[PDB]
Amino acid sequence: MWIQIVRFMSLIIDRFEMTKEQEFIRNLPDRDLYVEIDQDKITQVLDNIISNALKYSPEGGHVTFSIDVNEEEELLYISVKDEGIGIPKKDVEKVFDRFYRVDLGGTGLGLAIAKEMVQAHGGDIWADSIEGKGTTITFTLPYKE
Numbered sequence: 636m637w638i639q640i641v642r643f644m645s646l647i648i649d650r651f652e653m654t655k656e657q658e659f660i661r662n663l664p665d666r667d668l669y670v671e672i673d674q675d676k677i678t679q680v681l682d683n684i685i686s687n688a689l690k691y692s693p694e695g696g697h698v699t700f701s702i703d704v705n706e707e708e709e710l711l712y713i714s715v716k717d718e719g720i721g722i723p724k725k726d727v728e729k730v731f732d733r734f735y736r737v738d739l740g741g742t743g744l745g746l747a748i749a750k751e752m753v754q755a756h757g758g759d760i761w762a763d764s765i766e767g768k769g770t771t772i773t774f775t776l777p778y779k780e
């Protein structure tokens with residue numbers, strides 16, 4: 636089954652934008668884009684990435700969501716950017732590994748789950764980060780329309 640990913644994400648962000656206190660910025664197209672992934676799996680992917688962005692963010696920092704369309708590859712690129720503590724250069728591609736944490740204390744599965752779910756549905760995921768400036772997590776999903 637297919638879901639309209641723009642609507643879907645807006646509602647996810649809305650439930651985060653409306654609870655407690657933190658800013659949320661959007662680069663989301665007025666386009667009818669569909670992905671074939673169960674609601675609950677894509678929810679876990681996004682919840683896990685958003686949870687990290689907020690957990691590791693300071694001040695009234697911005698979390699920015701983007702969806703960009705690669706028509707040639709038939710892929711959407713979905714990204715979550717924060718202005719948080721960032722990730723050490725040597726660790727940036729360890730962060731998706733099961734139980735891996737940058738520093739007894741914590742689980743370290745959020746991003747492993749996100750990777751497994753994205754990959755199972757034909758996408759890929761990566762982290763771009765500068766220690767002390769912030770992190771972008773980006774994943775792809777096949778789409779139609």
Ligand SMILES: Nc1ncnc2c1ncn2[C@@H]1O[C@H](COP(=O)(O)OP(=O)(O)OP(=O)(O)O)[C@@H](O)[C@H]1O
Nearest residue numbers: 687688691721730736737742743744745746747770
């Ligand atoms: N947005 C981010 N900014 C800075 N560091 C991050 C960010 N996202 C993840 N990390 C680092 O990557 C590690 C792995 O993240 P992941 O979500 O898998 O585990 P966790 O948040 O530590 O635990 P869990 O999500 O299972 O409760 C984190 O422990 C943290 O060091």
Ligand SMILES: [Mg+2]
Nearest residue numbers: 686687745746
């Ligand atoms: Mg986490």
Ligand SMILES: [Mg+2]
Nearest residue numbers: 754757758759
């Ligand atoms: Mg693959």
